[PDB]
Amino acid sequence: DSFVIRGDEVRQIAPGQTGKIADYNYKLPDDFTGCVIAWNSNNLDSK
Amino acid sequence: ASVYAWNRKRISNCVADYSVLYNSASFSTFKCYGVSPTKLNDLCFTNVYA
């Protein structure tokens, strides 16, 4: 799964984590198996 | 108030929507103990001290 998010909101991307993106538009399973990889892309994706 | 002499407000006789706090981007942390912040609207108390 590939997307851009605000750097503060990366916390929401887990099993058991809580917040508006975890509630609405990117819920992971409560028993998710796998890896979350995130990095700053300001030089690529800001304007 | 200054942390040597911190100020305690009693909250009583009222309704609080804790989502108005917890949904805000303004807070650098919101760590909770004995309760989870998502549950606080479903639950109630004798008093709250801030």
**What are A11's two structure tokens?**
């916390």
Contact A18 B23 (CB under 8 A): no
Tell me the residues of B at the A interface, defined by beta carbons under 8 Å apart.
Answer: 23, 25, 36-38
Chain A CA closest to residue B25: A8
Q: Are A13 and A28 in contact (CB under 8 A)?
A: yes
Question: Which resolution, in Å, applies to this structure?
Answer: 2.8
Considering all CA atoms of chain B, what is the largest pairwise distance in Å, rounded to the nearest integer? 35
Nearest C-alpha of chain B: how many angstroms from A29? 18
Q: Which residues of A23-42 are buried (b: 16+ CB within 10 A; e: fewer)?
A: eeeeebeeeeeeeeeeeeee
Q: Is A7 helix (H, G, I), strand (E, B) or coil?
A: helix
Which residues, 6+ apart, have CB-to-CB distance to B25 below 8 Å?
Answer: A8
CB pairs A-B closer than 8 Å: 5
Rounded-to-integer distance, Cα B20 and Cα A42, Å: 30
Which residues, listed in sequence order, are joined to residue B11 by a DSSP beta bridge? Answer: B48
